[PDB]
Every structure is written in structure tokens, then in C-alpha cells.
Design a protein around this ligand. Sequence first.
Ligand SMILES: [Zn+2]
Ligand SMILES: [Zn+2]
Ligand SMILES: [Zn+2]
Ligand SMILES: [Zn+2]
Lengths: 276, 276
Amino acid sequence: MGNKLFVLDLGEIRVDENFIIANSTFVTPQKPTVSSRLIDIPVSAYLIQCTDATVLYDTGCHPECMGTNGRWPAQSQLNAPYIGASECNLPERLRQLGLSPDDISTVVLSHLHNDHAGCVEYFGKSRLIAHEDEFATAVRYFATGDHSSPYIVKDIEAWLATPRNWDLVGRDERERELAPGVNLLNFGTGHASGMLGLAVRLEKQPGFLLVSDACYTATNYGPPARRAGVLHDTIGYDRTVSHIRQYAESRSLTVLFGHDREQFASLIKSTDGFYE
Amino acid sequence: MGNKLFVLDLGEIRVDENFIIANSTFVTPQKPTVSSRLIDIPVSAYLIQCTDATVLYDTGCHPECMGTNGRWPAQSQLNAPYIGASECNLPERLRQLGLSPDDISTVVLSHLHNDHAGCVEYFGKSRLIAHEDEFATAVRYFATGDHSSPYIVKDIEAWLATPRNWDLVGRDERERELAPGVNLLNFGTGHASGMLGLAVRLEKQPGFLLVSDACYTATNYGPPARRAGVLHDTIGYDRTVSHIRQYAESRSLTVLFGHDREQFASLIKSTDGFYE
Ligand SMILES: [Zn+2]
Ligand SMILES: [Zn+2]
Ligand SMILES: [Zn+2]
Ligand SMILES: [Zn+2]
């Protein structure tokens, strides 16, 4: 038989919509008193049971990201708090499936930001696939003690506390087959310095293209395409959205967005099913 | 024999500060309804008289940018209006100095947006220097009747209504001497698709580096550098600001920003005198 896709509900973040869809609200002399609004956006990860491997795409937040002794800086916690339930953390979502981190053959990190690489430290054996430039950038923020970005220096510290099976994607690598029907795509520079996507072909359905922050929501996707806020490389980002569209459409893959509330409702969480 | 630089006051625009310094205001859980604020930013152009040249850098807004049959689309008029006084237009500022458009040898367009290339149609003889990619972009918006950007379709129509002496800077061209002590710099892709700067050496002080929207304000310039909103190419933008800093500091030139209210107020205007 073929590939199984489990959707891991790793909670929510509460954030200004302007970060997610740039300039969705702004003041004007005509309408000078308007304010932007907070939205709650889903944090997720995807466990793929392949033929000959188990592959995890993304890892959510660190279970202890929030609080006075939390992983996230105090100001980060004020600005855009993780809001998820006690259950909504990757180690629990794995134990709920009968899995330890060690049972995962490879974990594909879309990139090394806060609510994507938060559980990297739980993986002492699994192959950790991340873009080489994403690795270089994360470790630089850590080495300089710079808390000003979505890279979490305290999380990075834990990643580096013990040797791990890092496998860094070269910036000129285009794609890698991870297993039959499972292709790792190197989106490269855009939202962050090195974005990775995962194409997963299924049996009852053609399958899914996992894109993470290469496209936050269906409203970013369009058409017309609409930029997120806080993009590292806007040109790379725009090019990557067009590539995502062409790749998925030519293959009838449904694109699964990084943080789309209404798509994430509608899915089917790992505690009560999987895709086949 | 010495170069003379005139500062031309071409009025002001009212606009949400979040466009000028990105994410200067955003909502959070504890401050869920704060509004951004409107700021008034100066629009300017620079006239350089040299022994064997008269060079203009930028051109302001079209004098008839606002109104029911104004050049600007209603959305722009409503959202970020021009609010300059009646005399604050390029033809008048030249008239005040006893000059006509045909007295200008060369007009250097920093780029081809609304409040920079608004008076290009007045120049039927002068050499019009613009980056080739910036020209290509502007025409594309006009050709598709696309009003959605800072490119003004109705101004571009007027530019194209008669042949003009366009001299387009190649993508790979680094710098051009326009006259002794006046050097055209090709900043390339960043704020828009092709940005041009102008280094102007004087006799009684080192001089000035005119950078237009490659750096809107001293706040963008820093340190620490802070990105503007609505940037075409954030990476090229970042590199351009670093290049501006290195170029100017190494030569002790004063960087004149695209829309810095405090800086502009400090400058001697063309109606009061000029720099030598
Ligand atoms: Zn991210
Ligand atoms: Zn994300
Ligand atoms: Zn501009
Ligand atoms: Zn401007």
C-alpha cells in the first residue's frame, strides 16, 4: 500500500493580522481611527508514515515556550503568545500515536523559527533535514545572543547541547526523494533564509503539498497573491508562491498552508484520524 | 566652477507611518485596539548647476495629482493624499529660479513612482535618466491599466504621449560621471525595481548623497537600520542602505533622505539660497 498523513494539532498563536497579511489594515485621512485586529492562527506538524520510513514535517513550539521561565523572550510572549492547550505539543501528540521521537526516521524542518523548530531538541537520533542557510542563520542568532527575531536562542541552545543527526540541504539542491511519493522541495530564500516544502502523494486522493510559512494562508495564496508581513526576502517569497502554485496545480495536490485557521478546521486531527 | 545645489520644496504627503517605518505600530493581546498614526512627509527634488550641465534629481508629484480629474487614482487620493501648498510643484520651483524644463540638461529619476517622476512630461528635450528595469516596470503597469501600485498610470500615459530623450541605465552599470563632482550611482533593485542615487561634491563642504526612497528617513537609516513598509525587494533594499552608508561615510558626504521631515526642515531651500 502507500502513504499515511497525520495532522498534529500543536495549538494556536494570537497575533496582529498585519503580520500574516501585510497592510490588511492601515489608517488614512478618510478613516483615521481604524485599528488592526488579533487573529488566532493554527500551529501544526505532519507525520507521514511512508513505505519505508516515518517522516515528520515541522515540530511546533517548545512545550515550555510560555511563562516566566519560558523559552520565548518576555516581549515575544506579550506580542504574539502561544495560546494552545496542554495537549497540543509535539511529544504528547507523538506519545498519543504510540511514538517516541526516536521512532521518526527523519524530521524535515520547513525552517528554524519559533513555532516550527520548537521540538528539535527531542530528537537525538532522527535525521534532521534543514536548509544549510537556515541552520547558519539560526546558529548565528544563538551565538550572538540576539533575541530580536523569530529564532529562539534558548531553543537553539538545547538543539546544540548534544550532537544530532543534522543533514543540511545545499542551497543549490532542488529536490530530494525521501520515500516513494514523498519529495522534499527546496524553496530556498523567502519568508526566511531557507524554506523547505514536502510533497506527499496519497492513494484515496492525489495528496498534499506542505508549504509551512512559504504561504501562511489562502488569502496570501490568492489569486491575487498577497504578501505576508515580516518577510526576509520578498522576491524569493513571491517566486516561491508562484512555484508552489505551478507545482501543486500540475499535480492536483492540495496546498496545506502554514497558519490558515479555516483550512486547519476541516482537516482531521491525529487523535481522531489520518489521511490515506 | 564649483557645483551649486538647490533644494526644491515640492510639498508633503499624509500617510500611515507603518508604510514609512514597517510595523511601527501593531496590536497585541494587552493592546488589542491601538491605531497607527498619520505623519506628514516632505516631497523634494534637487537642482545641481555645474559649469557645463544643469542636473535635476527627481521631479515631485504631478501638479494636478489631486482632484476629481486628478492624475492619482481615487484610492491613493483618499489613502495617502498630497497636501502640499500651491507653489510646491516642480514647474513653479524652476520658474522661481528663472529656469524652464528646457534649461535642464539631464533629469535623473531616482525611480518612477508617483511623487518622484510626476513631472517627467514637462521634459521634451532633457535627457531622462532612469534605471532600465524601473522603466520596464512602470510601462507594464500603464500597459495593463493597473492602478494598484505607486506607479501612476495617467502620468505614464503623458510621458509616453510624445517621444522623449530616455537614457536608460543598464542593470549592470555601477556608476556614471555626469559632471565633475556629480556621480550617478546605480543602487539597483530595492525599494522599487531600479533605484538611482546621486553623489554631489561641493567646495565649502564635502557635499551630499541624494538617495530618495532607497532610505526614506533617518529612522530607517539608523543604526539600527529599520525597514520601510511596501518594499519591492527587501534584500536589495537592505544591501543598498549598507552601501549608502559605506559610500557616504567614506567620503564624508551627508545623506539626504527621501522623506525625512526633520532633516528637510534643516535644509536651506531654493527660495532662500543654495549650497556651494
Ligand atoms: Zn517562520
Ligand atoms: Zn510559522
Ligand atoms: Zn517609491
Ligand atoms: Zn518617495
